[PDB]
Amino acid sequence: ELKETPSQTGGPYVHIGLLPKQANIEVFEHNLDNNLVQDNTQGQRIRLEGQVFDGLGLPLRDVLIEIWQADTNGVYPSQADTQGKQVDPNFLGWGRTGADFGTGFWSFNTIKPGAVPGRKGSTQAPHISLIIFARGINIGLHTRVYFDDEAEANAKDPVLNSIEWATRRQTLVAKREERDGEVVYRFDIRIQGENETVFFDI
Amino acid sequence: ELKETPSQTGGPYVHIGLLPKQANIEVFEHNLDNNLVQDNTQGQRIRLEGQVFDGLGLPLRDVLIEIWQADTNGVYPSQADTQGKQVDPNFLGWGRTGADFGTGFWSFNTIKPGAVPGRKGSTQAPHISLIIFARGINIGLHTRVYFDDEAEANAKDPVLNSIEWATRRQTLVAKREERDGEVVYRFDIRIQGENETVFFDI
Amino acid sequence: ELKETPSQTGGPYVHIGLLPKQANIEVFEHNLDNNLVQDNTQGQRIRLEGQVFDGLGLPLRDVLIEIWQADTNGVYPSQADTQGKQVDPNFLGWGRTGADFGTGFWSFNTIKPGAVPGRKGSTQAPHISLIIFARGINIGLHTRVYFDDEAEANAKDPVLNSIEWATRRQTLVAKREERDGEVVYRFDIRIQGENETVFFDI
Amino acid sequence: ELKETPSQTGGPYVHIGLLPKQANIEVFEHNLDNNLVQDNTQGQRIRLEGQVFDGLGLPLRDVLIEIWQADTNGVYPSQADTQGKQVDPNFLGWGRTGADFGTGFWSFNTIKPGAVPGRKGSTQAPHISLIIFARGINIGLHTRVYFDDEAEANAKDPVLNSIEWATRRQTLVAKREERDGEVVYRFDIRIQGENETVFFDI
Amino acid sequence: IIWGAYAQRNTEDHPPAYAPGYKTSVLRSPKNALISIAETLSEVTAPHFSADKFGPKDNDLILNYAKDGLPIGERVIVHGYVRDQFGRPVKNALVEVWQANASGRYRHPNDQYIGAMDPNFGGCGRMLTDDNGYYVFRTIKPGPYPWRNRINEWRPAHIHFSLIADGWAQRLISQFYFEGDTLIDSCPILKTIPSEQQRRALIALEDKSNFIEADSRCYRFDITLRGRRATYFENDLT
Amino acid sequence: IIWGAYAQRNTEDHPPAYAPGYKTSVLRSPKNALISIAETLSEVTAPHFSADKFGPKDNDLILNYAKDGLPIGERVIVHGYVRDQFGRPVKNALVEVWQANASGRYRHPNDQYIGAMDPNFGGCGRMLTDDNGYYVFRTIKPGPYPWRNRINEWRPAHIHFSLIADGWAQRLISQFYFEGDTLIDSCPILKTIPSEQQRRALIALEDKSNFIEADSRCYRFDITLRGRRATYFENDLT
Amino acid sequence: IIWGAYAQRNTEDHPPAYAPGYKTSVLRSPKNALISIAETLSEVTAPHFSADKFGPKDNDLILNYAKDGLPIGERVIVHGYVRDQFGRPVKNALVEVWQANASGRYRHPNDQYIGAMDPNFGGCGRMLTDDNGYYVFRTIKPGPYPWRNRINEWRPAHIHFSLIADGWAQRLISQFYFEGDTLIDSCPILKTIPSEQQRRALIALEDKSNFIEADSRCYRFDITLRGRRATYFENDLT
Amino acid sequence: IIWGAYAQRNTEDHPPAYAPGYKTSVLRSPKNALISIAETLSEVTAPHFSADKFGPKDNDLILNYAKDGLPIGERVIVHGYVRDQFGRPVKNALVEVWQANASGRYRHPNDQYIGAMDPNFGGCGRMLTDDNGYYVFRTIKPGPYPWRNRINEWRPAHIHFSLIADGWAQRLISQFYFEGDTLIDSCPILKTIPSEQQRRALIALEDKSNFIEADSRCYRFDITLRGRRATYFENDLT
Amino acid sequence: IIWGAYAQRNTEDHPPAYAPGYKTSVLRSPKNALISIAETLSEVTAPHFSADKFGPKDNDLILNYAKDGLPIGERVIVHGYVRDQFGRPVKNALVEVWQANASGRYRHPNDQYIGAMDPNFGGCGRMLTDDNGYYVFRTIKPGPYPWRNRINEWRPAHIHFSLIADGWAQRLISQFYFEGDTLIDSCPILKTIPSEQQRRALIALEDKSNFIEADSRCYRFDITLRGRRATYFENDLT
Ligand SMILES: [C-]#N
Ligand SMILES: [C-]#N
Ligand SMILES: [C-]#N
Ligand SMILES: [C-]#N
Ligand SMILES: [C-]#N
Ligand SMILES: [C-]#N
Ligand SMILES: [C-]#N
Numbered sequence A, B, C, D: 001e002l003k004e005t006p007s008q009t010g011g012p013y014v015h016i017g018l019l020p021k022q023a024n025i026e027v028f029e030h031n032l033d034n035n036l037v038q039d040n041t042q043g044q045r046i047r048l049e050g051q052v053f054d055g056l057g058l059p060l061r062d063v064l065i066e067i068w069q070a071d072t073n074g075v076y077p078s079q080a081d082t083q084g085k086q087v088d089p090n091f092l093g094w095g096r097t098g099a100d101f102g103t104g105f106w107s108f109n110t111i112k113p114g115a116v117p118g119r120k121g122s123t124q125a126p127h128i129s130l131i132i133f134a135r136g137i138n139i140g141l142h143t144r145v146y147f148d149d150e151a152e153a154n155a156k157d158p159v160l161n162s163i164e165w166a167t168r169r170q171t172l173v174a175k176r177e178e179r180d181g182e183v184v185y186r187f188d189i190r191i192q193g194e195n196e197t198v199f200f201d202i
Numbered sequence E, F, G, H, I: 001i002i003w004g005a006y007a008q009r010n011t012e013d014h015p016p017a018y019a020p021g022y023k024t025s026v027l028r029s030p031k032n033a034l035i036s037i038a039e040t041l042s043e044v045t046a047p048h049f050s051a052d053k054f055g056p057k058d059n060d061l062i063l064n065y066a067k068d069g070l071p072i073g074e075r076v077i078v079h080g081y082v083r084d085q086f087g088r089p090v091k092n093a094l095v096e097v098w099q100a101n102a103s104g105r106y107r108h109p110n111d112q113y114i115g116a117m118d119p120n121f122g123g124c125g126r127m128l129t130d131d132n133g134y135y136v137f138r139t140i141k142p143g144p145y146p147w148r149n150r151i152n153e154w155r156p157a158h159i160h161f162s163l164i165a166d167g168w169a170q171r172l173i174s175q176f177y178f179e180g181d182t183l184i185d186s187c188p189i190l191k192t193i194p195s196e197q198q199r200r201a202l203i204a205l206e207d208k209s210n211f212i213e214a215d216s217r218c219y220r221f222d223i224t225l226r227g228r229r230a231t232y233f234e235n236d237l238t
């Protein structure tokens, strides 16, 4: 048996390779981005935004974020999904974005995911898997984003209930807002200190 | 090539060897102290005072402090100074003092230093290099003292701007005061915790 | 990665295994020989003959020779040929022969090969790849046979021009002759000494 | 005691570093060359020319040559010269040149050197020390150039007489010629084969 | 074959989150331990990227950004295999790479190193592994990068890489170095990795037999990802 | 897969052309160095031999020449695999072998050794490797051969072999010996090979589990040929 | 010679700031990493101390405090050289030393150890290195000091020393011990130093040939400070 | 001091003239042995080059040819000492160096390697050693050079150097390589040198303490030339 | 610098006075132990010999006694350095040497060995060390000397030497031998020396690089004398 290749930080210039556009590099015709909603994508459009703060309470202006989620019916656009259901044919389920060099804000245009089956016939509350990479971070940090308007589902969520420190569970719940006619979930990540965001080893 | 002799704490009784007087030991005729201002020393006299706090917010009553600074025209009384200018002949530019065993306050009677040339034709804001030794401190801690009445110079200072966490820069700025007709700069050092003072590896 | 099996001389009795007939051994029904021209083989018939001389100028009477060449249109009867052209279906392109035990002369009955594509869109002059094995020779020696009636093509040949010692290039050109109505190219090989034949590491 | 740094070939592109001009590289204001005769240089001007041939009898078109000689009175422009005599103040005594990329000819414009003292009160015949570097040559080859119009001096020369194979001595004697009113000594060097030039280990 | 969950990540084969020797990690590392969870469909699934979206020069860093001419530097080919810890090949995995140029200069706005920019070099490429888990790209060997950890810190020459494969749990980003580089033994980032055998797992090996004469050198570099266990009894994943 | 050229032959893994210890090589070795060339279609192609031309006993040296009875000597089977340096099997390669008889006598007009001729033994065979690069023939173990290099020179027992495969560049002729033969350590021909590991690459190993009871012994011998590199960028072969 | 900046301090050759084994360091160590800066005139300069200010007995701890008689204890001379990392001698550097007496008692108000005070011993001295970087002082060998880290902690015999030389960046304070002292292997303070070779760099060696008969023993102890690099191209220090 | 002759060159510490592994040496090597001679004034003397002739950027390969900008590549400083075999420094010796650029491309008409030319890099420099035999120049680290010995031959990265010192007998031209370069172990030219210790005498060592932060790396490389013996009895040189 | 006394002679680095293996020492060795004393001016002072008194051939044993021709034997040069135990050179020290001739015959009335006398060889020389403590003389290599300790005793080839330097306490007389001489391992006189390292301190080393072609060989031999300690406190010498 072989050992997993060891992780290393994404580095300060991580944008060159994963978000060329943000680094003013036009080399690829098709660029991967933070927009998971296509023309015929099903579900309610939502905007996921926030910031990432270090131990001093300062936003990281060089962090890279990616998300992985199921479609509106809780089916993953992945061959590994064994639900036997047909997935939204116009949904990649993944996206990537970088914090703004000036303000530090990041965001994704996506769809609110449907409930996904849990282990042993349970049901997971709607959630988006999120990972962050950046200078100073030796291994990508895994976390989940739940929605505050799904209070009843969250209370019965297996993963949230596997966190024995009930106080920390709230750090995984994004807050709903409505700029105009658009739904926006605010999710700030705190890597260190008080209200430190929960990170998982998946 | 040889390796630098490894550092060790100054120890709890560091006064015996570096400030005999404070330990009631009269062995030297000429004792080194915290008074850098001589009769014919040029520049505006100033008093630098403060305290050193540990991680609990308690002052160290056994800490030893030394400072190194340029004269009023920004020239160092050192053969290593390559400015080609003549230095104040009545200025050592260095001093040593210990915190008070009871209160914890320390102080120096010196002169406000003039601006010193930076690297690549830049200009450093007026500053005093300071180092602290004490029980519990394995290697002398280096820091700098800037003055709050030099706001414009500080904003353009190379070293201060090399600190990416803008919030920490203020920890290096002493506050001006005026007991009677004397100018006093208050500079407290916090080794650990919130508002932790910035320390350099020079 | 593995290393190539090391070479060894073909030995003095190399005929037993590669030319049984010449050693008076009838064991195989179908014997490989020096006649590459079949009934329906296309191209002008030619006879290639010569001798192999050692360092003393004496012919080797125990040498074994093999040739590899393209058909009349410069296509190799090999699956490795990527020209996309159809090859002469009645041409093996290979042959084997031994020097005569008494005189030392060797010969092949074949066809004059057509030009073969070179590297980077170039064109190689018509040639026959030849290799010799024998007692005293630790590794088969590779060489090429060009024709003197192809002066213009030879001058532009990539391989011939890759020999910086212009004087040695002539050692690879066979001389045309005509016994009666047959074309014969005389090609003598000199392993050592003056006019030493050029040998390649292919 | 330390060992001499091991030698390595000068390489095929040796001109870049030792004769930039010949490689079309203008980087130095003052370039070292093959002209040892200055305006006020004493002695009879002479031209030294020739070619360098490899084992095939072909001229090396990438060889580099340097010479070292005494002035017209047999004194070396070197602090190591212990003759106690004053040397020609307008003579470097050294020069460098490269064979022509096309023809292979090399040449120097210099002065015919005067006799130099030998070991144990002897007298050396007039000579020029010469060394050659080039691709394929692992260590610079040392040789000497004597003049055929100095037959009487050459016969008594210590170095020439230290060559027990009398036949090889002639390989070190250049032949005098006269284009118009100029004296030219032809000196061809044969690295390998018949009439192979004598090389010294100095 | 009915697949279960990915084998547990071995935390001892990876650098810790907090590594004082690597300064910027002091404020960007959680003080709380990671919460380990049992996997669900979310962790065992991942996106699929169609080959149709990839340009013909996406894996050729020597030419995908060349404008007036070729990039200045050492032409090198890098190839290898991507397998899971159980030796199974990882098919159609997205491999993205990026690096500095021959001067050790990154084509990034925040890079002010005096090393010279190369107008003909971009520094990024990508590709999908084939059915055997094989991958291959071409580039210019990057020069070491001077940075500010301790004032005179230098990263050995390195190429950044990222993989998105079959399971989200396999998501990995790392860096590989070149055999022989002396800076490897003094780099604080490479030293965050606990064991010596793991550090060597990040070194690309010179592959001399695969050099292309008068053209390019070649380095071999294999990648190992986490693997799934098969299930033969209860299947609680769902 | 688009193939490029065969990897460069490693001259250090082969005997030099000039080897004074092997006398006859003194006059049959070029004084000039070999001129290395970049490969073309001529070097990467080779002939194909159809199996239809091979007789049923071509790989059976015990019976392909037997007239009145069986050859006298040690019945042995020799088998193994032919691969290229990259481990790929070499399919349908022509393998020809020849040897002396049990007395160390070759059935060749120029052989006058007093060792006795065997009227039922020829000494030559041939065969094509299968799809796995496997080959197998049967023969009589050859006896050592006394020869005139130094007056009392003796070749250890050996079987000559030749291969013609996919590329002309792979053309190879050599000899293999039998494990344990003491003459191996004193043979001038085997000593022309520079390294000890390469010399051992010519020794057939006893394969006891594949002996056929009350019949024949068996030796295992694998052969490695030069291999082609695959091309993923410019293809200048043409 | 135009001097540049001092070579970077090698943090791995020094104890870390946070060392739990040394209790008082837990609250007196920054949680933030040190910010490394490029040197300026401030860091490369330092004060000069004239020899005129030094008394004749400043480097003689046996007599500079003697009142009614001589101190009780082992008469020992300590000498050595102060060099920079590049082997250059450090001239006219201020070397200050202090220590406990033969009982292991410090003449300090905060010391209540039952070890007996010596009315004829002060415990402090100072001196300037000569042009060869040589220094020499005389003292009484200090006795081990019992202290409260863990309840039964004992510092091996030691002498504290401090140096102010040519550059502020060289400012250093440390301690040296005596060869053979068994307490050396169990001291938490000495163990804050990462490597064994560096720990031994703090041990004064017995120098038997320099003992003064019927008078004093002698220990040799050399000190290495950071050194400046010379500049041959751009000089950005200013 | 009255000087005699230079010590005899030790032929075993140098490559032989004839080295078949290095092809071009086969026709450019004398078949006759070198004739050793006793030295005279001709062999113990050499020319003197005044510093007045050297431009200010002659030892700076990064800037002496820069036109529109800086050369692309790894900024490195190389320095060291030139001594004679007896350890005496070699003063005012002419040191000339040349090399290929970061692509492994030489600015020479006969170089057609596809490696890219750098319009801002020339590849040659020179300098005189000081009174301590010290030398220092700046350049771009050269890339390996593919060449035709065997078809896929590659020179490790290297810088050519030449010295003209006090005696003609010391005339020397060689090449030095960089620590860690893997091509060093397979180069036919470096292998012409008989001993391993001598091969390592041509490797420039990484000198980390002399790196210039955010600017250049540094390599240390010392050179040893033949030395003269002093005479105390008969002086037959003249 | 104010000098004190010479360091104590280390009796363990010298042969004892009583050594039964060396017969004549049995009656010429004190039975009482030596009385050690503290040095005074008498022990730290010594005479000075002006160079004006030395003839030009005093250090040339090959010519200082030659009458009709040259001595018969091996022409050898011997040179080296005289230092004190602290490495300081010993300047203007008087070095006197004497020896037997090439036959192993001493030009002394009490020598009746059948070895042949050389009318052109005297066997004695002298010289003063220069400012670097360097010395050099020329001679004929002495042949071994048969003597009567045990009946068949043989002294290895040896040269006797004596030194008078700066202090009377340094007065020393000894013998040195030549590297490789087999008699060295069986000589009773050399065995009176306790340690092997000290025995080797008496062996002159072949110095091949300093051989003078077609003339003389050369041996290197350094001598170490006792050294003075410097005083920094009380100076009781007076
Ligand atoms: C690198 N970032
Ligand atoms: C870069 N890391
Ligand atoms: C100790 N203080
Ligand atoms: C004490 N320290
Ligand atoms: C065997 N021939
Ligand atoms: C047989 N050879
Ligand atoms: C390189 N020549």
Ligand SMILES: [C-]#N
Pocket (backbone or CB within 6 Å): D009, D010, D011, D012, H155, H175
């Ligand atoms: C390049 N030699």
Ligand SMILES: [C-]#N
Pocket (backbone or CB within 6 Å): A011, E145, E147, E155
């Ligand atoms: C990257 N540094």
Ligand SMILES: [C-]#N
Pocket (backbone or CB within 6 Å): C011, F145, F147, F155
């Ligand atoms: C076969 N001999």
Ligand SMILES: [C-]#N
Pocket (backbone or CB within 6 Å): B011, G145, G147, G155
């Ligand atoms: C100190 N203790």
Ligand SMILES: [C-]#N
Pocket (backbone or CB within 6 Å): D011, H145, H147, H155
């Ligand atoms: C250079 N080759």
Ligand SMILES: [C-]#N
Pocket (backbone or CB within 6 Å): I145, I147, I155
């Ligand atoms: C002497 N004997």
Ligand SMILES: [Fe+3]
Pocket (backbone or CB within 6 Å): A011, E145, E155, E158, E160
């Ligand atoms: Fe990076």
Ligand SMILES: [Fe+3]
Pocket (backbone or CB within 6 Å): B011, G145, G155, G158, G160
């Ligand atoms: Fe203490």
Ligand SMILES: [Fe+3]
Pocket (backbone or CB within 6 Å): C011, F145, F155, F158, F160
């Ligand atoms: Fe045979």
Ligand SMILES: [Fe+3]
Pocket (backbone or CB within 6 Å): D011, H145, H155, H158, H160
């Ligand atoms: Fe080169």
